Amino acid sequence: NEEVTFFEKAKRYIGNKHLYTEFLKILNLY
Amino acid sequence: KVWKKQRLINKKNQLYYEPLQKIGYQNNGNIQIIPKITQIDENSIKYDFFDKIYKSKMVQKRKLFQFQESLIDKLVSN
Amino acid sequence: IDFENEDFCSACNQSGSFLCCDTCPKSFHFLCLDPPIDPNNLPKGDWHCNECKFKIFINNSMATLKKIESNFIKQNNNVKIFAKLLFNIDSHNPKQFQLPNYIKETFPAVKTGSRGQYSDEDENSIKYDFFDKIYKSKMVQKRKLFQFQESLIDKL
Amino acid sequence: TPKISLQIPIKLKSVLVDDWEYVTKDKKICRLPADVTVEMVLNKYEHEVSQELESPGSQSQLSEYCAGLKLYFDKCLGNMLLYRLERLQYDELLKKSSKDQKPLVPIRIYGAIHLLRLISVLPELISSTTMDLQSCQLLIKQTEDFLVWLLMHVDEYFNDKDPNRSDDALYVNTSSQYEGVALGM
Amino acid sequence: KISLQIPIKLKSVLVDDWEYVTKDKKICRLPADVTVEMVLNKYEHEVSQELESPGSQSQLSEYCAGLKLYFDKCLGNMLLYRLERLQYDELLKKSSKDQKPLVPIRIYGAIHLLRLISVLPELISSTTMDLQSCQLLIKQTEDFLVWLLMHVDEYFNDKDPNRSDDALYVNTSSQYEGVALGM
Ligand SMILES: [Zn+2]
Ligand SMILES: [Zn+2]
Known part of the structure; x- marks a missing residue:
C-alpha cells in the first residue's frame, strides 16, 4: 500500500537513471 | 569476508544469464540490471529486499518473544 | 529420395491403421494427434509431425531457435518458472503415459513387458504485502496469546 | 542440465500402480x-497455504507455481498424460467441444x-531440460511440498470410499466400444 | 608458435598479483605456508591413484620432477619482479651464512x-623441441591447471595484510622500497 509509494518516491527523488541503478545495486548487495 | 565484485572480462567473452526464477536467485553480488553476469530486473530486487526485511523482522521478534516468555517462567519458578 | 516408413506408432510403438509424414520416417495413428484427427478428416496436402514442422520453422538455425524461445520466455513472464517446460510441448511428439523406471522399483508384485501392460503378482505487490501483514498480525496476536498461555498455566 | 531426483512417497506410487492396474487389466x-476438477484442487491448495506464509516472495512463488502447473497440466493431457485406451474418450469429447463453438480446456473435466x-x-521432464541447478531445485522442492500436502489429504479425493457405488468410485468400466478399439478392433 | 589455455580465474589471480607487487x-x-613442493606432491599423490596404466604414472612423475628442477633453476633468473629482488638477496644471504644453499621450491608458494x-x-617456443613434445607439455600443464582451479579456494585467499594477519602478502617499509627500487 505505502511501500509502492516508497519505491516510487525514491525513483522520483533520485531524479537520474544511473543514480537509481546504483541505488538498486546497493539494495541488491544488502 | 571479502569482495562481492568481479573484474570486467571483456573481449566479448562476458556471458550473461537470465534466471528463470526471480524471487530467490542469489548468484553473486555481480548482477546487471535489465529493463558470468546475472541479468536481474527492478521487480526482483524490490521483492527480495522486502522479503528479507520482513522475515528478519518477524524472526527477531519471535526470538525476543521466546526469550522473554522463558524469562517469565524462570522468574515465576522462584 | 523416398525413405522407408516405420511400421510402429511410436506413441505406443504398436502397429495398426496409421499414416506417416512426408519428410519424417516414423508414422502415427489418426487419433494420436493433438487435436486428434478423424480417420477420414485427412489434412489438405502435405502433413508433418512436430519434427518437420520444427525443421521448416527453425530454418535449421540456432539463432532463430534461441530468438523465438527468448521472446517466448518473455511472453510467459508471469509463469517464468514453467516457461522452459512449456516451450517443449509445442514441438515435442506425443507418446503414451509411461512412468519412468525409477518409481516401480519398490514392489515386486507388478509385472510389465514390451506390451506396456500391467499384471498383478502493481496490485500484485499490494496483495502480497496484504497477505504478509495480515499473517504477521495474526501470528503476533497469537504469540502474545502464547505468552499468555504460559501465564495462565503460571496461574496454577 | 542436471540429474535431479524427487522424493515421492511410496504410498502414492502404490496408488498410481493401482490406477494403472485398474485401467489396464x-x-x-x-x-x-x-468430482471437482484440478482447477478446484489447486484452488483448495492455494487457499490453504497462502494464509500461512508471511513474506511476499514466497506467496508470489506459490501463486506462480500453482498457475503454472494448472496450464501445464491442461496442455500436456493429450500428449503424454492419458493412456492409449481413453484416447477415444479424449477425441470424442474433443469433437464434441469443437461442435460446441469453443475449444475444450481440460481443466474443466479431469481430476486428481x-x-x-x-x-x-x-x-x-525437468531433467531433460536446460534449466539451471537452483531453478530446477526450487521447482522440485515446490512440487515436493505440494505432493506432501497431497499426502495430507489423500482421504478427500484419492481414496475411493463407498466403492460399490459407481458414481462415487470414479472408475467406470468401458462398454464394447473401447474394449474393441483399444487392442485393435 | 605455442598456445596454452588458462582459466580466467587464474588470469585474474595473476593480474591481482601484478597489481600488488606493483603499485x-x-x-x-x-x-x-604451502610451498611449491607441497602443491606438486599433493597433486601427484592425488592423481597417481586416478588412472591405472603405468605409462600415465611415469609421465606424471617425470613432469612433476622436471617442473621442480625447472622452477629451481628459473626462479631467480626470470620469475621475480624488481621490488622482490631485495627479498631474494636477503634470503640468499641468510642461507649462505648458515652454510646451506638456497632451495627455492621449499620457500616460494603457488x-x-x-x-x-x-x-x-x-620458453618452449624459444627452444628447438619437437612438436609432439611441445603438445605433450602443454597437455600436462593444462591438466595441472584444471586440477589447481579445483583447489583455487585453498591456496589463493584474500586476507588484507593491513587488517588481521597471515595474508599471502606483506607490506614493505620505506627502507626496503628505497634500497630495492630507487637504488
Ligand atoms: Zn499409436
Ligand atoms: Zn512428420
Whole structure:
C-alpha cells in the first residue's frame, strides 16, 4: 500500500537513471 | 569476508544469464540490471529486499518473544 | 529420395491403421494427434509431425531457435518458472503415459513387458504485502496469546 | 542440465500402480467430469497455504507455481498424460467441444489422478531440460511440498470410499466400444 | 608458435598479483605456508591413484620432477619482479651464512608456480623441441591447471595484510622500497 509509494518516491527523488541503478545495486548487495 | 565484485572480462567473452526464477536467485553480488553476469530486473530486487526485511523482522521478534516468555517462567519458578 | 516408413506408432510403438509424414520416417495413428484427427478428416496436402514442422520453422538455425524461445520466455513472464517446460510441448511428439523406471522399483508384485501392460503378482505487490501483514498480525496476536498461555498455566 | 531426483512417497506410487492396474487389466477408466476438477484442487491448495506464509516472495512463488502447473497440466493431457485406451474418450469429447463453438480446456473435466500422473512425469521432464541447478531445485522442492500436502489429504479425493457405488468410485468400466478399439478392433 | 589455455580465474589471480607487487608495494610472505613442493606432491599423490596404466604414472612423475628442477633453476633468473629482488638477496644471504644453499621450491608458494606456467609457452617456443613434445607439455600443464582451479579456494585467499594477519602478502617499509627500487 505505502511501500509502492516508497519505491516510487525514491525513483522520483533520485531524479537520474544511473543514480537509481546504483541505488538498486546497493539494495541488491544488502 | 571479502569482495562481492568481479573484474570486467571483456573481449566479448562476458556471458550473461537470465534466471528463470526471480524471487530467490542469489548468484553473486555481480548482477546487471535489465529493463558470468546475472541479468536481474527492478521487480526482483524490490521483492527480495522486502522479503528479507520482513522475515528478519518477524524472526527477531519471535526470538525476543521466546526469550522473554522463558524469562517469565524462570522468574515465576522462584 | 523416398525413405522407408516405420511400421510402429511410436506413441505406443504398436502397429495398426496409421499414416506417416512426408519428410519424417516414423508414422502415427489418426487419433494420436493433438487435436486428434478423424480417420477420414485427412489434412489438405502435405502433413508433418512436430519434427518437420520444427525443421521448416527453425530454418535449421540456432539463432532463430534461441530468438523465438527468448521472446517466448518473455511472453510467459508471469509463469517464468514453467516457461522452459512449456516451450517443449509445442514441438515435442506425443507418446503414451509411461512412468519412468525409477518409481516401480519398490514392489515386486507388478509385472510389465514390451506390451506396456500391467499384471498383478502493481496490485500484485499490494496483495502480497496484504497477505504478509495480515499473517504477521495474526501470528503476533497469537504469540502474545502464547505468552499468555504460559501465564495462565503460571496461574496454577 | 542436471540429474535431479524427487522424493515421492511410496504410498502414492502404490496408488498410481493401482490406477494403472485398474485401467489396464479390467481397464476401468475414470469418469468425465470428475468430482471437482484440478482447477478446484489447486484452488483448495492455494487457499490453504497462502494464509500461512508471511513474506511476499514466497506467496508470489506459490501463486506462480500453482498457475503454472494448472496450464501445464491442461496442455500436456493429450500428449503424454492419458493412456492409449481413453484416447477415444479424449477425441470424442474433443469433437464434441469443437461442435460446441469453443475449444475444450481440460481443466474443466479431469481430476486428481491426472495430477498425480503429471507429478510423476515432472522429474525426467525437468531433467531433460536446460534449466539451471537452483531453478530446477526450487521447482522440485515446490512440487515436493505440494505432493506432501497431497499426502495430507489423500482421504478427500484419492481414496475411493463407498466403492460399490459407481458414481462415487470414479472408475467406470468401458462398454464394447473401447474394449474393441483399444487392442485393435 | 605455442598456445596454452588458462582459466580466467587464474588470469585474474595473476593480474591481482601484478597489481600488488606493483603499485601497492607489497611482497609475499616467505617462507610460504604451502610451498611449491607441497602443491606438486599433493597433486601427484592425488592423481597417481586416478588412472591405472603405468605409462600415465611415469609421465606424471617425470613432469612433476622436471617442473621442480625447472622452477629451481628459473626462479631467480626470470620469475621475480624488481621490488622482490631485495627479498631474494636477503634470503640468499641468510642461507649462505648458515652454510646451506638456497632451495627455492621449499620457500616460494603457488603464485610463482603460476607465473612460471603462464610464461612457459614463450620458453618452449624459444627452444628447438619437437612438436609432439611441445603438445605433450602443454597437455600436462593444462591438466595441472584444471586440477589447481579445483583447489583455487585453498591456496589463493584474500586476507588484507593491513587488517588481521597471515595474508599471502606483506607490506614493505620505506627502507626496503628505497634500497630495492630507487637504488
Ligand atoms: Zn499409436
Ligand atoms: Zn512428420
